[PDB]
């Protein structure tokens, strides 16, 4: 899609008429293929595998903040004539999902967030994040990505990963435009995201949390939310990648009931 595209790039897959859409949102540096292994177990549903700004086919789409990502999401949904939908988001995508849900997306059935941060409490926690994210923006923007990603996957959230998993992920994410990656990282930084705890409780939509059992960080964060948390065994932050069958199982419990 071009630089100034009104809608995000996404891969649509049609399912049974009358079943809601499953709108899948990848994490930072991923693309629309992220949730395809898990989503394809739900092929009776219509699936929208979105490319977030700066990622995959949405690489040229530029955003200032979350309001812009939400608008784009809204326009993309209208574009595919999606009125009944679920937002299934991993990490950055989970954060995008929660942000869009709390701004208000008409037709939203529910949000399923996997390792998504509900938001930091004060502007001090935000400052610490702005400082750390300003450092990441600079590296993605100027350095070779095989180098930035090797350290990115060395971050505490990815501690649970083995060196073979980190190798495969570094290679996979390095197929990206650092400049557009960096812009999105800055646009939707934890530093600029509000505390969504009250908003995620005072919701009109259904809300479910998924978490790898090894992801102690997001397990504790989930515990603070008014949501059904589904702890995915033998899995880290990206639980759908490490354990796709377990995440399908959890999604089946959620969606097929
Ligand atoms: Cl990842």
Author numbering: -4 to 252
Authors' account:
Re-annotation of the activity of an earlier enzyme in the pathway, MenD, then led to the recognition that the true enzymatic activity of MenH is to covert the MenD reaction product, 2-succinyl-5-enolpyruvyl-6-hydroxy-3-cyclohexene-1-carboxylate (SEPHCHC) to 2-succinyl-6-hydroxy-2,4-cyclohexadiene-1-carboxylate (SHCHC) by a 2,5 elimination of pyruvate from the cyclohexene ring. MenH is thus correctly annotated as SHCHC synthase. EcMenH adopts a typical α/β-hydrolase fold, comprising a core β-sheet of mostly parallel strands surrounded on both sides by α-helices. As is characteristic of the α/β-hydrolases the three catalytic triad residues (Ser86, His232, Asp210) are located on loops of the core α/β–domain.
Accordingly, we report the structure of the MenH from E. coli at 2.75 Å resolution, along with the structures of two active site mutant enzymes, Arg124Ala and Tyr85Phe, both at 2.5 Å resolution. Structural comparisons of native EcMenH with the two mutant structures, R124A and Y85F using SSM shows they overlay very closely, with rms differences of 0.26–0.61 Å in Cα-atom positions over the entire structure. This shows that the mutations do not affect the polypeptide conformation significantly. The active sites differ very little, apart from weaker density for the sulfate ion in the R124A structure, due to the loss of the Arg124 interactions. Arg124 is held in place by a hydrogen bond between NE and the carboxyl group of Asp128, but has its NH1 and NH2 groups pointing out into the middle of the cavity. The sulfate ion forms hydrogen bonded ion pairs with both Arg90 and Arg124, which appear to be the primary determinants of binding. The main difference for the R124A mutant is that much more variability is seen in the orientation of the pyruvate group, with the loss of the guanidinium group of Arg124. Two conserved basic residues, Arg90 and Arg124, are in position to bind the carboxyl groups of the enol-pyruvyl group and the cyclohexenyl ring, with Arg90 having a particularly important role. Arg124 projects out into the active site from the lid domain, held in position by a hydrogen bond with Asp128. The structure is not perturbed by the mutations.
